[PDB]
Design a protein around this ligand. Structure first.
Ligand code: HEM
Ligand code: HEM
Ligand SMILES: NNC(=O)c1ccncc1
Ligand SMILES: NNC(=O)c1ccncc1
Ligand SMILES: [Cl-]
Ligand SMILES: [Cl-]
Ligand code: NA
Ligand code: NA
Lengths: 713, 713
């Protein structure tokens, strides 16, 4: 059956904005996962999970009698899809149970691990999500095997369909670099936003870069990919050595014995895959990665044996029974237990990427420290594991249940608690009047609040106006934020703030974070008034101001907008067309297509463009909130053509006279081109739509202003 | 960007069940189109449209100074995608303005026609849909040129995204038959559910079958395709001759002058396409089909000159300036006006498919009658035009506005007016008790009501339990309806009805259509009781009983279920997997994936399977409403394998012992295989879900029972 995607493969795809509708969700519209989880007996779940660890099922027998290693890998993979570039991936949506992740080569036999968990899921039902359960199971596996974890938070609501996530353009699983859809260019530069070296891997190739078993070169790919997943050198060494303290790999026979991945398997396989024709196809005979490495002398107990082995032997390159490159310890005795046969033992073995931890000079120093100081290793691993598994959960207000760590961590972008009375409706009116009397313009107020609030992305729930981090490094210096204009607005607002706070009694004060947002609302109210509409914009106080020292400048760098179609901004020239980047941004902001449409048309006429560009400013009454953008965009009296100078900029000329009327960008004109977008523009460009436009614009403005307000949830 | 669709191109696609979410709709949740339309000044819209007919725009100059012909083609194409096999296509959702239809070859330059309508759309806004406006514009064109139409109904609400519609498997536009994805097999048998001869055509090729200019052969394709669009010979001749009384075709130069269709054009084209490099690219120079035919001496006035020409000349095969086969009148005077030059005239011309109306024997007799009696021609065309343009609108209760024809037409599947008091809640409870006391079983009651209600399809809003047509030919003898069991149930219900109606005073009575639905509700309530749960199933009275004489038996044939996964029924062996046919049925029933999942699991345990098959009956308490289907489906203690006898039937055996527990079909086991469906099954198979299951089942049951109840809208 030929589809629109087949006919017009490069056309813009809006269906990513209409994922996660109430249609696909089996839970009622009023279902609140947090409330369900708060009533969960978490301690009872943990007991059940502890019992599961050593209750082997014959259809996938437990290595060494203990599933712990398998479940730690499961949880690590759930979390390890995360990318700092867009915040997409991670454990926070339980997407491991959907395509494509349920069927990635690197997730082979984690279908078994998830199926082991079904009885527990079934028992507790809606009170624990799959997303929470995968991580909790990893925690309990660690605990069972003698490692005390740093904490756990619930609150990852299940999702009910696959995410639309760009994982790369290769058409072959595991394709090596330099092919027709290569994710590498230049001096092994990995394309943004990707964080894995090959399609279907979590981070790197365990044999080495493109399969070449050079631990030094592997270490470069590790560093790069783990950095792109928010981990530094210390964290990376702690995690890899920590993980590989447990369990084993599986490569008992050739990989050609392994059949279809879950999404390709027969209906009778009931959601499982990689069925193996090698011997019993499981347990002693299992084939997962194709490697056959067991790292420690006690694979089901926390130990200090990973680094004893790493440093205590010299390593010889060898092959697994499936033909994969791996390393074996020169001259060693057979001291590593077999997973199934008590009369067999093995020599110590390592992956190429384990050897990275010794033969990369920077990792070597960390590895030695952790070798000599195992309590530092233990602490670093506990902290990194918590971080890995909670990275995408958002503000601490979202963390549920009785094991949430009290320690506030820098990577959480923390926001101070509010310790004083908030401003009320009268105070808000008074502050808005002051803001409008200062001389700040509609354009300045709307631009500044948009800049502050629109850093939020729902993928990892980072960013937003809470914290007033727009006044700090690096946000205050971002080109899109118009640093010089921004400094002047913040100075005026700081003065208004100081004078209001000065005049209060009791504890009462207003944060700059709130006043930024409030002042934007005032700008919108004023724009509406300029257009003859009497409008109040909703405002919710309670934001607090974070310090510079509470704001990791390096980690904040990934939130910088290099494309923001809502401000007609593009920082450079990219391969992806700007209207694809607009829809991507709308998705991160949680906007539907109608919300995207209304927001953009409003912001254009309010003066939110970077540099006060005229592109898409299709009105003769700028800073008045009207539907002019739509009425003028859709006017057939104007003809559009790309410019000689720049084929990404378009001139709109009167059809009859040739006179230039407007200019616009791809982002502006797509609303008059794309057949679904133009249908939405038509609604808002109709003669009956002025009040609808205004009211819908106010609603989406407010929604953006509140995106990070999990304190009000 | 590689997607799930690319990795697993044969997996089941559920997103068709989640179109038309509130997310993609720009209108508020309370928007009621009917209410907006009922306040439209229709007469003022018509005056505006009348003026538009003769107000030429220089970007697409009007042929002969009148756009009427263009708009009649536009409306005919809006309606002419319709297929009786599934009720998909037609004008009723305004889908011409979205992909792929906005860009089909046969819809070339109707982008111009829709753009001409923007000013009027913009003026009246939400009070007239695009879907209504396309048809109304066709009507006003006809009216303006002297043709009295039969009527017009409003009520087609706009839609906001493209439908998912199978239009064929060819990967090349207009591909001639016999390709690798040929829609023809055997002796030119067109595959169901298609109703056109080539990909991107409305019905047939105007040059002749696969381009071969033989009017006799062409007539075979005309008859076939028009029959698949619900039109008999008389209707077909009336429509084609009627339409081709007006306007002209466009083929002024070679077709290689024509550029990209709208979905492939540059952003600057602002939603238009087929930009032509031939001379001015428009007006006298236009290229649309590549044919250059003008049928009558008065293309802007209703006449009987199509038939005067068709019969009054002999016809010679010739070529247009674009190279297309067409016909010219031998030895004729130049009597046909030119569209732009008043000093030029032309000989009469015809399409191959116009000559079909003379050289097919059966068409010839109709065409002669219409030639000799143009008043019969006018009436037949008006009736056929109404039918064409309203075929997919559903029950007459949906028809809005002041021009709805009073005459009731057989093709409308009419339902008699109710002229008496309805039963109340006490009466309903009394009837449910009587039904349960008769000895009719849960299985019988549920199966009968399902059979009655589940003929509804939202594609053309035909079918449903209103009418009690299940008691008439042909429904009463459809194999899926279990004719012998059905007859016994209907007899018992008719006796209950007669006794209830006999005992009433004051005109109150219950229709059999209502009692069938009510009896099913009693079944579901009793099943719940059997499971230990007291529930009330909602029930709305007001259905009426249609007669055999009010039921077109041939037209009812397309509503026969040949696949109904909800009753585990497949009438034969098909190329399309049964789970794909399930999802197709769910879509026609307007179900989401969760609704589909709940409905199916309940029906299996209530005994709704045709022939009392045990397939998928995963319970030991049949005729109790429980979630046993899900709990048992998802039990990892059961292993599934296809049978030796039949690869589409599966045995579930205990994993440990090999004991046979269950059997199932692909439709049953897909819920344990497909990763999105299994996630939904999990929810309903959890230990906290019995009350949720019952409540959601009751809700979707009620929704199905009410699908055709536009009398309650
Ligand atoms: C350079 C990064 C890494 C590479 C290349 C890597 C590679 C692998 C491979 C190939 C396997 C064998 C899969 C199989 O055949 O069953 C494995 C197993 C495992 N990895 Fe890693 N890993 C990495 C990082 C991590 C991290 C960060 C953790 C956890 C903190 C972790 C924990 C595990 C565990 C527990 C197992 C054993 C699974 C079992 O016992 O069944 N790994 N790893
Ligand atoms: C066998 C069925 C039919 C065939 C093959 C057919 C074919 C065509 C073609 C090839 C054109 C020229 C397109 C262009 O170059 O602009 C055309 C024009 C037209 N057709 Fe048909 N047609 C059919 C049925 C109908 C029906 C059922 C109607 C209306 C009741 C209709 C009304 C028209 C009108 C009004 C035009 C003139 C468009 C203009 O003036 O711009 N046709 N037809
Ligand atoms: N790919 N997933 C996202 O981009 C996303 C998910 C949830 N809220 C916002 C964005
Ligand atoms: N293609 N679209 C349909 O089949 C349909 C549309 C609306 N309700 C039910 C079915
Ligand atoms: Cl994601
Ligand atoms: Cl459709
Ligand atoms: Na994420
Ligand atoms: Na339809």
């Amino acid at each position: 059956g030929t589809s629109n995607r087949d006919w017009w493969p490069n056309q813009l795809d809006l269906s990513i904005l209409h994922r996660h509708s109430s249609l696909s969700d089996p839970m009622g519209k009023d279902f609140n996962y947090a409330q369900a989880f708060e009533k969960l007996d978490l301690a009872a779940v943990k007991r059940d999970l502890h019992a599961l660890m050593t209750t082997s099922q014959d259809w996938w027998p437990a290595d060494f009698g203990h599933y712990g290693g398998l479940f730690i890998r499961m949880a690590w993979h759930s979390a390890g899809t995360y990318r700092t570039a867009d915040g997409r991936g991670g454990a926070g949506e339980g997407q491991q149970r959907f395509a494509p992740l349920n069927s990635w080569p690197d997730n082979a036999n984690l279908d078994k691990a998830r199926r082991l968990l079904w009885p527990i899921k079934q028992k507790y039902g809606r009170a624990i999500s799959w997303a929470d359960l995968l991580i909790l199971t990893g925690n309990v596996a660690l605990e069972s095997m003698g490692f005390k974890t740093f904490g756990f938070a619930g609150g990852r609501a299940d999702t009910w369909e696959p995410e639309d996530v760009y994982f790369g353009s290769e058409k072959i699983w595991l394709e090596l670099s330099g092919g027709p859809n290569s994710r590498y260019s230049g001096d092994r530069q990995l394309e943004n936003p990707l964080a894995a070296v090959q399609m279907g891997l979590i981070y790197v190739n365990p044999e080495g870069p493109d399969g070449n078993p050079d631990p030094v070169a592997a270490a470069r790919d590790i560093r790069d990919t783990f950095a792109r997943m928010a981990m530094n050198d210390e964290e990376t060494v702690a995690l890899i050595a920590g993980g590989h303290t447990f369990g084993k790999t599986h490569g008992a026979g050739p990989a050609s014995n392994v059949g279809a991945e879950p999404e390709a398997a027969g209906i009778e396989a009931q959601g499982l895959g990689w069925k193996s024709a090698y011997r019993t196809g499981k347990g002693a005979d299992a084939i997962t990665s194709g490697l056959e490495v067991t790292w420690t002398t006690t694979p089901t107990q926390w130990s200090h044996n990973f680094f004893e082995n790493l440093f205590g032997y010299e390593w010889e390159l060898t092959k697994s029974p499936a033909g994969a490159h791996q390393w074996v310890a020169k001259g060693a005795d057979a001291v590593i237990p077999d997973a199934f046969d008590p009369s067999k033992k093995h020599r110590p073995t390592m992956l190429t990427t384990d050897l990275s931890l010794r033969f990369d000079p920077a990792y070597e120093k960390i590895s030695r420290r952790f070798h000599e100081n195992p309590e530092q290793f233990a602490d670093a691993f506990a902290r990194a594991w918590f971080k890995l598994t909670h990275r995408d959960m958002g503000p601490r207000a979202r963390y549920l249940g009785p094991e949430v760590p009290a320690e506030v961590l820098l990577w959480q972008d923390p926001i101070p608690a509010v310790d004083h009375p908030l401003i009320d409706a009268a105070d808000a009116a008074e502050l808005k009047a002051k803001v409008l009397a200062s001389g700040l313009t509609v354009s300045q107020l709307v631009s500044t609040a948009w800049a502050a609030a629109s850093t939020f992305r729902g993928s990892d729930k980072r960013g937003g106006a809470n914290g007033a981090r727009i006044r700090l490094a690096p946000q205050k210096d971002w080109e899109a934020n118009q640093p010089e204009q921004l400094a002047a607005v913040l100075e005026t607002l700081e003065a208004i703030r100081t004078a209001f706070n000065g005049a209060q009694r009791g504890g009462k004060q207003v944060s700059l974070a709130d006043l930024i947002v409030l002042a934007g609302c005032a700008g919108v109210e004023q724009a509406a008034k300029n257009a003859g509409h009497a409008v109040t914009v909703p405002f919710a106080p309670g934001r607090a101001d974070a310090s510079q020292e509470q704001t990791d400048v390096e980690s904040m760098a990934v939130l910088e907008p290099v494309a923001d179609g809502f401000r007609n901004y593009l920082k450079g020239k990219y391969r992806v067309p700007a209207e694809v980047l607009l829809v991507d941004k709308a998705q991160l902001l949680t906007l539907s297509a109608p919300e995207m449409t209304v927001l953009l048309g409003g912001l254009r006429v309010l003066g939110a463009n970077v540099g006060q560009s005229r592109h898409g400013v299709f009105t003769a009454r700028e800073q008045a909130l009207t539907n002019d953008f739509f009425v003028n965009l859709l006017d057939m009296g104007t003809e559009w053509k790309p410019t000689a100078a720049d084929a990404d900029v378009f001139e709109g000329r009167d059809r009859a006279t040739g006179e230039l009327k407007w200019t616009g960008t791809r982002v502006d004109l797509v609303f008059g081109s794309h057949s679904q977008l133009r249908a939405l523009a038509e609604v808002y460009g109709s003669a009956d739509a002025q009040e609808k436009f205004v009211r819908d614009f106010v609603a989406v403005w407010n929604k953006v202003m509140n995106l990070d307000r999990f304190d009000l949830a």
